[PDB]
């Protein structure tokens, strides 16, 4: 099967809302050891974001019932909810370590050191899926995936501050998720607000650098930064 056919199947799987097949198709494209275009980069991201997103929503629903059923005391019913919450947990973790495998072995590796837009994209993507692992992890297992998530984000933030425009959608989106990581995972609203506000201030200071094409995506992320700021302060 040709590479163009795999990308066509991914676009076809997207319209048919079959996001599991879309991820398998874009994984096959990734495994060709060739770099991904800006379109194929978003196709892979959209696919796995929907696959892991479906199991993120299921876990939060079951985990909430698990904390709600703990007052029942029925050991036969509590162990059944605990086992189900664990099964969705394993599926969520397998998807994450699948994306991290593609990122470390193929995507970030085959990234030319001169292409900073893709390196920041993949490093942010790497920090996203380690954050999804920390959403369901406890104890030292959580401390490990939190440390890995901070490392991928911090490495992406330093590259974006030196070779990318403050109004670039990828640098803006990275600071949005990074600030969310400090708020939802580390519970640091002061650190979350300082990062979200700084990226908002840097973009405003260089608002003339808004690209004639990507300004629509840049302004939406800037709105999301102030929406989180007003929500956290």
């Amino acid at each position: 099967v040709d590479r163009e056919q795999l990308v066509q199947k991914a676009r076809l799987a997207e319209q048919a809302e079959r996001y599991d097949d879309m991820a398998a198709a874009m994984k096959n494209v990734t495994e060709l050891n060739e770099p991904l275009s800006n379109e194929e980069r978003n196709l892979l991201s959209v696919a796995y974001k929907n696959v892991v997103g479906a199991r993120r929503s299921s876990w939060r629903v079951i985990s909430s019932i698990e904390q709600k059923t703990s007052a029942d005391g029925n050991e036969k019913k509590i162990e059944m909810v605990r086992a189900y919450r664990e099964k969705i947990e394993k599926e969520l973790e397998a998807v994450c370590q699948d994306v991290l495998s593609l990122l470390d072995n193929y995507l970030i590796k085959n990234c030319s050191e001169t292409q900073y837009e893709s390196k920041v994209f993949y490093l942010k993507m790497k920090g996203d899926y380690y954050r999804y692992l920390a959403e369901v992890a406890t104890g030292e297992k959580r401390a490990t995936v939190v440390e890995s998530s901070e490392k991928a984000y911090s490495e992406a933030h330093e590259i974006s501050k030196e070779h990318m425009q403050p109004t670039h959608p990828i640098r803006l989106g990275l600071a949005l998720n990074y600030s969310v990581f400090y708020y939802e995972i580390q519970n640091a609203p002061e650190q979350a607000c300082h990062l979200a506000k700084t990226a908002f201030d840097d973009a405003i200071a260089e608002l003339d650098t808004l690209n004639e094409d990507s300004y629509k995506d840049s302004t939406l992320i800037m709105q999301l930064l102030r929406d989180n700021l007003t929500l956290w302060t």
Binding site: N177, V180, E184, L224, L231
Partner: peptide
């Protein structure tokens, strides 16, 4: 509330 990028 999952205030991340969509």
């Amino acid at each position: 509330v999952e205030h991340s990028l969509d």
